[model samples]
Target: MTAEAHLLLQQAIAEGATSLDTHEVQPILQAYGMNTLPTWIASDSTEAVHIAEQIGYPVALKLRSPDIPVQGVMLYLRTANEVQQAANAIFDRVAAPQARVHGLLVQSMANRAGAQELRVVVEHDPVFGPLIMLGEGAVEWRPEDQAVVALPPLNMNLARYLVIQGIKSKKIRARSAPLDVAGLSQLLVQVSNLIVDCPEIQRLDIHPLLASGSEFTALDVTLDIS
Candidate 1:
């Protein structure tokens, strides 16, 4: 994403946008002067402590274990006490079951209802250079509702309208969307660009992309890259 991705991300934020859990994507977003939580990736407890010290109390911790495809117990520590508690729990639990509970990611918690969720997964195919998937409203969108992925290089209309094809999203549409339409559009664009640009990416997912009015924010995101 360094070459193609930074351009897209910077353009989006510059046009008035925001989202959750951007990693290397954070620096790109920050370049556009967007307000995002100050984040520091910690490879060791010492680095984690340093970030906590600099950022102050009431922090959140998460494990950046790569090469796995499962959720829950992705630590979300809320305080100094929670940091130690969560870290210890992560070490004892996921350290062996999953990837060696390396590098704890500390982030701030956003307060809002989990109204919208989006997934933009990109996997390379022998037949295609890059294949992309766009889904709606949760990591667990109903099977019947799951939209067949659209390979990248999408435009604004395709980006926003592709979501309507999602069975879950169509259901939401039928029932009168629970989220702000404008926010959903913003999210679609942000994620669409991510998919188009991150050609080496595999499995980009963001659950509970919350929306309040025209403001859309990513609540959780996970991606695997080669």
Candidate 2:
């Protein structure tokens, strides 16, 4: 699994896309045992619609900009006609003189049922190396309220403690959710391993990582590799 991820990093490094943004980071996440909705990089409106249909209906369109900040607007299209309209409309919004439009990211819709949103951060501190932190809420949903930190090279026991230490992990009140605490801990351990293995990774952020039962899906990822 991680071999593919390492190759992805290598290719990105070769291409000099060290600062991999949302649309570009999906494949890397998928390679590392994290689920990501099917996504495509579209050059224009026609291509966007063609790819959208291949992935099926009720898809999401995200604008990929060069400035590291894509707009907050995510257009959800339920039909083929709606998708066509949205493709042109999305580009229009980013057509201003200063706006830097790179391309469009079309993704399959995720079923949010029984899912708990999470935020994972791995920042390489000059003094401490890699400091791993798991926070309560995603930046999109709410401001940071509570978080717990665990040093890298974490085991199941350490990961478990880290997860339970956070305020939101205690109750995990989600509708019809059979919250798998152990599975979440294992995910943290995998994350810790990723940081330990990849020294070039300067920073990694996965916001709104949907956790449901035994599955951990990365809703969005932004990574910086040196």
Candidate 3:
């Protein structure tokens, strides 16, 4: 484990936070050698536009809040005007009178043409300790029906087998685009190492882990601690 990751976790714990948002958890993932899209936090539409400009065109804006669920996400916003309007719209819709609006999360858009979206999760169980899960990134997910489970501390060989098992069981499928098994396995191994190193992470969720050829990028992530 990198000292950076350890320090971040310790700092979060000291602050009495039970969960880490996308912005906070992203660095921890990076410390473990995982790829995540460039992201920034914006407090308002003007700030969002500035961040979008810095990140280049075709950016994505999502409502970031701890108290409220994400009402919508704006994608493929090409111009400063589009970014400003989208950011305002998201806040207007999601941040109701009683809801707390943290801010807007500005991110560089990734090409999704032939990329396969996958979900990976690591959760601690009372009897089994930490268990890693791999599944498809469907809107409605039933872990028992769709996920392939494995224990942590996985090597390349074990990770490859886990991916194969998912395919063999038909839990994961190749759609219009082919799945990059080698890259996915390497990512899983990295995740395994992360969980093995950080016991404080009670849960880690990576939704829409986009895979294209040998390239993989984590689009959204959340982490929880006890």
Candidate 4:
């Protein structure tokens, strides 16, 4: 496993977010410039409120536990109700007593725009160091649609493949609305290169990294390591 997967595993196990068993490997993803969920950690109600205020209204609170993994994958908190309810729910369920649940993270939701999500990852190989795994990020790993497996340092053609995999349903022609094909292509190449270059990477996943949209941005990123 890459170092990314290693650290993420530690984080997920500590937070208890082990549902489909994902979470923990994200730094390399950041290196890929993938978007991440807004996160803020606070120790108490006062601090939580302060963090929330800094992060601004319409945030989500989570009972952070490196032990728990599946805290809330689809926590789309947008209102005060969401903040309070989500926070309280996490507190009661995961952050109660036995564990040392203190701080809370008020975060903004992601993935409200665009279609197509791309899942491009890197796996370690003792001889090669890293291998690129690019796919359309379908309902599952069933990548018969558009997936690419290649070596590091992807050229322009490979970059186009990444975008194609991401937007298999949509054509790559110039869009009426503003889109970033070059940027997306570059993003894929960059991510692939990072996976190969970055030593601390075990596993990376970005389900539905929105593509072909005028307003494209990194929505959320999570990872893990051995």
Candidate 5:
């Protein structure tokens, strides 16, 4: 798995890609045994509808460009017509002048109710090198107020400590649902391993790592390499 991820990174560098899109990042996440929602790429509305049909209804459409803002994300698209309209709308809204369109990504929608959303980030620090951070998944969350930092190469115990720290500090709350500390700790350890194993990964963001019971699924991930 490590070799496969390394090869993917090398290929992306060869292609001069500084950031990896959802489809491109999926395999890399899976290589580290991370749980990711099933995703597919569509060049047009017709293709989006077809993929949605195969994946079943209630899928999501997101514009496949890092330059575009968050307005391109359309979720809970159930019908074929809705999928078609959303695909076209995303293109129409984001594919403006100077914006490079890379098509759309169709992903299976995850259950939101009774789920805890968490953000796991890996950022390179000049003095500390790679730092692993845990925080809430709110869009407007201030990292300084909510994020707890740790160094990588964490074992099971260290990872658990980080998770507990987040809870004890009230940075992450289990209000709607019960938080799974063991599952989240395992995921943190996996993220740490991925960062340590791949030196080229300059930044990693797994936003909205949804947790329900013992299941944790990474809904959106953006990985950057230098």
Candidate 6:
């Protein structure tokens, strides 16, 4: 993300947004030149189906429930009926009236075959200000085996080091897959800028971010601000 763009995002977030919903942060991610999956917030199954039609079929439906911890492949729907069924599940299986469902997140499923899922994290440190980390995708992964840290204010040199050091990079090179290392480096740099430019951002998590030969798209993201 350019310095101007990052500043604009910070301005938007300053509008009293403490914690942003998934859809709320897409523009913020994009401002930093990070690609995000096609997503929409649906008020109901009908809205979900409508969104699915626009984005195409084979969409994933997730409940924006309050109590439950959101996780992987909540429900993948390939048809209209499935979309409705999954939307209903938000109320029936996922949450009830008491907890209150915020809405359903409808996202187009990215082709995961031969693609590496990566987790990019940014957190504030007492001394360092912003610490960036990259590793094998998934929040549950053991960082000891899969993670590496990068200092903020990252240049291309530092960013590439951050990527090449990880195990996932080796696999990408072995397969002759297009890793777009330059783009990845830029992404890491932008993330660093996001943290530096916006100190209000206490934590940023982009997990299972799909990386292919052509581009890196954030499939899901959660942002917390102080």
lDDT of each: 0.53, 0.73, 0.84, 0.55, 0.85, 0.72
Candidate 6 matches the true fold with a TM-score of 0.83
**Candidate 6 weakest ten by summed lDDT:** 168-177
List residue ranges in candidate 4 displaced over 4 A. Answer: 1-37, 61-63, 67-74, 95-105, 125-129, 137-139, 143-146, 161-179, 212-216
Encode model 5's per-residue lDDT on 105-137: one tens digit a residue: 999889888788888888988998998888888
Candidate 1 per-residue C-alpha lDDT over 1-226 given as tens digits, one digit per residue, 9 for 90 to 100: 3465556545645654343245545653333222244556776655666677677766666666554444324444556656666666655555356464446677665544433444445556788755555455654754334654555565557655655554444544422235554445445555556556444455555454445455555555644444
Q: Comparing candidate 2 with candidate 5, which one achieves the higher lDDT?
A: 5
Over 4 Å off in model 1, which ranges?
A: 1-25, 28-38, 44-50, 53-58, 67-76, 92-101, 123-132, 136-144, 148-151, 163-169, 173-178
lDDT of 6 by residue, 1-226 (tens): 3565455456656775555656767777777678888678877778888988888878898766434444424545789888887777664665236755667888887889888787887876799777777766755765445566777888889788767765354522422335677777788898886776677678888876778866888887877775
Candidate 2 lDDT, 160-212, residue by residue in tens: 87666553554333235565778788878878887877777899888767777
lDDT by residue for model 4 over 82-118, one digit each (tens)? 5655666566565347775545555665545445555
Error of 5 at 55 (Å): 0.7
Across 1-226, the per-residue lDDT of candidate 3 in tens digits comes to 4888988899889988777777778888888889888778988899999998888998998777766334568889999999988988987776355655668899998998888888988877889889898898877778777898889888999888888888988888754457878888999989998899899998998888888878889998888886
Higher-lDDT candidate of 1 and 4: 4
Worst 10 residues of 3 by lDDT: 63-72
- Over the full model, what C-alpha lDDT does candidate 4 score relative to the true structure? 0.55
Ranking by TM-score: 5, 3, 2, 6, 4, 1
What candidate 3 gets wrong by more than 4 Å, as runs, is: 68-70, 94-100
Q: What is the lDDT of candidate 5?
A: 0.85
Candidate 6, clashing residue pairs? 178-213
At residue 151, candidate 3 shows an lDDT of 90
Pairs that collide, model 5: none
Arrange candidates, best lDDT first.
5, 3, 2, 6, 4, 1
